């Protein structure tokens, strides 16, 4: 039933604004003073419970914390018309940023703020009766996202133990870049996330920009569009907990079905009926077309090509008016294709889910209205190419200790760079070995 | 996150006066000090540069120092001069005489305690202190000597903060004073040890900007000080307004300096264009980036084509797409690939801010870290060695008390800075 | 032309937000005329669901 | 200190740095003896 959301740093808070806007509009949470003055669904239902708790007087409050080291973005949430929602204790802001230094966030500044965050999360976790996971949004390219994200997941992993943790993460794009020190922060972050996360969702900004240019008709996209797409994906995955359906899927089923070995937990994500209003009125959108669409690389939200690898597992979530027989016909057609390949040790490669609630339309939004949608998370060996490129860029910079003096000044030993680089090299070797056929001479 | 300003010497006091006019205009503060703005976004970060006095009033967080009160009386007589706190005006009783050693050792040690007491008193009142901001010329006498003395004292007292300096440096042809090489060399020697980041401006570059780009028939020092105030106010813009990708002085320093000695940068501001001509310019991101890399808009005499960029930063003000910024910076890196140092995979940092400077629909300020600055240091070392070998004017400084070994040490340290720039310029992967 | 200047959040997510609904206001504005609203709720004390019948 | 303004940061009971002194969320507790087992087998008359 319950899930707690933790938003860290700039990308995580900006994606959080879009997420809570969407979940409010889907449930019907509105200003108390603003009477609807119009026809509404009017059905008292428990669906809010996954994200809201009641005070008994009927006010709703959301299960989220906003964490940042610079004040500007959180002070911006405290000044809008959305101040009335969050409990003021939930909006936590520090005094100064981690200045793109992972060492500064982890050792110097996040160490002061971390105990307040754990006390607030405990106060939230005490007001639950069937918590089944945390959703975390952060980018590993920046200093506070890497350092405080690692420190907070380590403390959560010791205190809460077996509970599942699903992360939505914005990784550094392979050639578009915003800061010079991105490789160092991403390697050091990835070292901590490897040990302390149950499922990791992979995102690349260059893919979501390409998807918004090719499918939608936007010449000049901005971060609000990407965050609205991320919010739609999170709403699709959490819909299985909140509404009636033919084949439900609990969040523990994702972890049991998608992860074969405890280190192989990095997954790709994609969404099908991303379509504009002008195209939407020229075409029908049946199940087989969107099932064929989710496997084309033009539909993916991460810049990797799956034709250069092998699928290990796919989890397909369908929402809206779909009938299981059409899903079975679609999956049999996908299975026939020769350019889609599964490792021979994974014969039953698919898990299906079918939910009746169609995706919501937001008044200022750019997506069209559609009766059905499908979202996919899949595990594939192609991901090894992203790490190889980050490690090559790290090796180029690290051969001359290009910026190490900042990290050494903020408290970290030079040895830690080599340890993290060797651990990510071992993850690359794991993906090389796991994908090798166990063929036997006879 | 508040900045404390220090204004030293004639150049520093005049540029500071124009800077505080520009900042007061941007936040809608009347010349009486009363807030009269029309949006909370103006008020919500006013603390960054102003302290609040009782019943509405604001006072600017600045210390004014000079050795003869003529300039101080001129700035106090100016249109916004009344805003300054009277106790913050510090002056002596005899001039610097254009001599670094007298300004640093004899009248410096006499006045320095009262300025340090005021600067410490102002800094310790803040709930969290960000770096100091100092404006001065390096070629003068009280600017160089007392500015570097104060810089050294603040570095002793606040070693964990950031230290930023803005400095004006001598043209190779337009000298205003005969003894410029000694004062410049000693000041650069002091700054390279004490400073964290130093910005440099050539009066020759501002003259060429005004004549070629703005086509001014009769420019005045108010225009040059307005260009400087524009860049200075642009660098701090992300500290005090919302945006899609926030940035900070410490974040700029960590991304711009690869090694601690390489902290001297060039500056530029893009939507500069002369009055009268029906061409508008600046109406899209390609226009700003193309003008941004045009050497007509760069504030140093050295030209980038003789060097290579180690790193660069662009801070954009205005409502714009991140794709146009990102794809323009990628296209510029790919098309001019020979001018970017190859062992760094991406040399440009971008930042976007929602609030533009008043009267412009959009603007960008550019900061560049380029090795061509080594030609300027070589030029200063040549003129210094020509004068020192012949003892051209040393008796004034020696009469104040300096040992010649300080001059030989400062020359050697500057020569080593030139060598370090040259080795990193010609480094290769192999 | 440049009298109105929004920021991106207010332009996209909360466009209809008037200047009277933000935390910072002048000290000479009336407060009794503004309707009370200090939390978010599904219903506006609506009678269809809150009343318990007997 | 970390919170700011307080004389001193209050001690925390929920969490701790030391892994052998922190308080786990999922307390692994005991079932009552009544609700287990089979109970008496009772026959009707056919």
């Amino acid at each position: 039933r319950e899930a707690i959301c933790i938003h860290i740093g700039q990308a995580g808070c900006q994606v959080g604004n879009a997420c809570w806007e969407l979940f409010c509009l889907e449930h019907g949470i509105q200003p108390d003073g603003a009477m609807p003055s119009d026809k509404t669904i009017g059905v008292e239902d428990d669906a809010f419970n996954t994200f809201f708790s009641e005070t008994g007087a009927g006010k709703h409050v959301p299960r989220a914390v906003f964490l940042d080291l610079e004040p500007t973005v959180v002070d911006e949430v405290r000044t809008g018309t959305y101040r009335q929602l969050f409990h003021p204790e939930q909006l936590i802001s520090g005094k100064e940023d981690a200045a793109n230094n992972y060492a500064r966030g982890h050792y110097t500044i996040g160490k002061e703020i971390v105990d307040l965050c754990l006390d607030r999360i405990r106060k939230l976790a005490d007001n639950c009766t069937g918590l089944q996971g945390f959703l975390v949004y952060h980018a590993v390219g920046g200093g506070t996202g890497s350092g405080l994200g690692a420190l907070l997941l380590e403390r959560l992993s010791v205190d809460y133990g077996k509970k599942s943790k699903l992360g939505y993460t914005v990784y550094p794009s392979p050639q578009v870049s915003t800061a010079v020190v991105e490789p160092y922060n991403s390697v050091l972050s990835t070292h901590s996330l490897l040990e302390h996360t149950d499922v990791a969702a992979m995102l690349d900004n260059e893919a979501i920009y390409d998807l918004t240019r090719r499918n939608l008709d936007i010449e000049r996209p901005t971060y609000t569009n990407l965050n609205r797409l991320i919010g739609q994906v999170v709403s699709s995955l959490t819909a299985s907990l909140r509404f009636d359906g033919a084949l439900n899927v609990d969040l523990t089923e994702f972890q049991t079905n998608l992860v074969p070995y405890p280190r192989i937990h990095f997954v790709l994500t994609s969404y099908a009926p991303v379509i504009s209003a002008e195209k939407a009125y020229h075409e029908q959108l049946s199940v087989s077309e969107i099932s064929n669409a989710v496997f084309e690389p033009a539909s993916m939200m991460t810049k990797c090509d799956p034709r250069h690898g092998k699928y290990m597992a796919c989890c397909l979530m369908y929402r809206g008016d779909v009938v299981p027989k059409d899903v079975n016909a679609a999956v049999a057609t996908i299975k026939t294709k020769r350019t889609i390949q599964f490792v021979d040790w994974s014969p039953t490669g698919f898990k299906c889910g079918i939910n009746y609630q169609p995706p919501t339309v937001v008044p200022g939004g750019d997506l069209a209205k559609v009766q059905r949608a499908v979202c996919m998370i899949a595990n594939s060996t192609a991901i090894a190419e992203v790490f190889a490129r980050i490690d090559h860029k790290f090796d180029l910079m690290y051969s001359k200790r290009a910026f190490v003096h900042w990290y050494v000044g903020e408290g970290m030993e030079e040895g830690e760079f080599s340890e993290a680089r060797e651990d990510l090299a071992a993850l690359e070797k794991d993906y090389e070995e796991v994908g090798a056929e166990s063929a036997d001479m006879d | 996150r508040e900045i404390v300003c220090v204004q030293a010497g004639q150049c520093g006091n005049q540029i500071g006066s124009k800077f505080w006019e520009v900042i007061s205009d941007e936040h809608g503060v009347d010349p009486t000090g009363t807030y009269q703005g029309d949006s909370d976004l103006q008020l919500e970060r006013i603390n960054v540069y102003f302290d609040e006095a009782t019943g509405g009033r604001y006072v600017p967080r600045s210390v004014l120092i000079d050795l003869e009160p003529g300039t101080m009386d001129s700035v106090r007589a100016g249109p916004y001069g009344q805003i300054f706190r009277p106790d913050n005006f510090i002056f002596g009783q005899s001039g610097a005489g254009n001599n670094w050693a007298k300004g640093h050792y004899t009248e410096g040690a006499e006045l320095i305690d009262s300025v340090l007491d005021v600067c410490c008193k102002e800094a310790e009142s803040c709930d969290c202190l960000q770096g100091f901001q100092i404006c001065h010329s390096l070629g003068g006498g009280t600017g160089s000597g007392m500015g570097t003395l104060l810089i050294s004292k603040l570095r002793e007292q606040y070693p964990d903060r950031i230290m930023m300096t803005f400095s004006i440096i001598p043209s190779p042809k337009v000298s205003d004073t005969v003894v410029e090489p000694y004062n410049t060399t000693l000041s650069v020697h002091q700054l390279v040890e004490n400073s964290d980041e130093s910005m440099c401006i050539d009066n020759e570059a501002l003259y060429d900007i005004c004549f070629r780009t703005l086509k001014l028939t009769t420019p005045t020092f108010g225009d040059l000080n307005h260009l400087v105030s524009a860049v200075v106010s642009g660098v701090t813009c992300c500290l005090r307004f919302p945006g899609q990708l926030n940035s900070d002085l410490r974040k700029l320093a960590v991304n711009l300096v690869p090694f601690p000695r390489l902290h001297f940068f060039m500056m530029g501001f893009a939507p500069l264009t002369s009055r009268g001509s029906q061409q508008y310019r600046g109406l899209s991101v390609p226009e700003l980036t193309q003008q941004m890399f045009d050497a007509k808009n760069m504030m140093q005499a050295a030209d980038p084509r003789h060097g290579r960029y180690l790193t660069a930063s662009a801070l954009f003000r205005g409502r714009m797409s991140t794709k146009e910024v990102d794809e323009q910076m990628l296209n510029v890196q790919n098309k001019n690939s020979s001018y970017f140092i190859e062992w760094i995979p991406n040399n440009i940092k971008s930042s976007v801010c929602d609030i533009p400077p008043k009267g412009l629909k959009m603007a960008v300020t550019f900061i560049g870290n380029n090795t061509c600055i080594q030609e300027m240091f070589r030029r200063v070392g040549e003129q210094f060695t020509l004068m020192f070998r012949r003892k051209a004017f040393l008796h004034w400084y020696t009469g104040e008390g300096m040992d010649e070994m300080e001059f030989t040490e400062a020359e050697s340290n500057m020569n080593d800075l030139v060598s370090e720039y040259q080795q990193y310029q010609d480094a290769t992967i192999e | 032309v440049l009298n109105c200047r929004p920021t991106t959040y207010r332009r996209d997510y909360i466009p209809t937000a008037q200047p009277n609904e933000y935390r910072t206001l002048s000290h000479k504005t009336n407060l009794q005329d503004m309707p009370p609203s200090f939390a978010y709720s599904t219903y506006a004390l609506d009678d269809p669901r809150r009343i318990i019948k007997y | 200190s970390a919170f700011g303004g307080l004389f001193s940061d209050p001690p925390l009971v929920s969490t701790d740095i030391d892994p052998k002194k922190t308080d786990p969320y999922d307390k692994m507790d005991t079932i009552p003896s009544r609700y287990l087992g089979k109970g008496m087998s009772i026959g009707r008359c056919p």
Partner: peptide, 28 residues
């Protein structure tokens, strides 16, 4: 100086803003 840590006197601090803040209306 009385053999202490230099004849410098450190001025006090004025305000200390906290981490969590209220969301009630604030006036100019």
């Amino acid at each position: 100086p009385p053999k202490g840590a230099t004849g410098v006197w450190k001025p006090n601090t004025f305000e200390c803003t906290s981490v969590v803040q209220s969301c009630l209306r604030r006036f100019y």
